[PDB]
Design a binder for these strands. Structure first.
Length: 35
DNA sequence: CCTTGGCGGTTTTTTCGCGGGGGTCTGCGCGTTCGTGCGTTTTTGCGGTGCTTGTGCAAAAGAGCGGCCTCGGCACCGGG
């Protein structure tokens, strides 16, 4: 009985809203330079 | 200042949007494996100096010669 309980996943949109805030706060280029 | 067609209020009618409900599927989330970008050092190209290769601008005398001229000598025209 050495198993691990999993933290499951986030709802659709939660990580979306997080990354929305993160990308709207920062200003770097989002397209890769060489392509 | 004249004129009349059209806005406007009122009354019927008619019809499209939203909500509810239901169902479906498709991006979202996460895990695993793979790629190909940024970062360094090495390689090839453009340039300059030094060295190497080409080349223009005084009579005197004899001997020999070409042109030339007089001349020799001959054949020839004209006539019978």
């Amino acid at each position: 009985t050495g198993g691990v309980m999993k933290p499951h996943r986030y709802r659709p949109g939660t990580v979306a809203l997080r990354e929305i805030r993160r990308y709207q706060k920062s200003t770097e280029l989002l397209i890769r330079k060489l392509p």
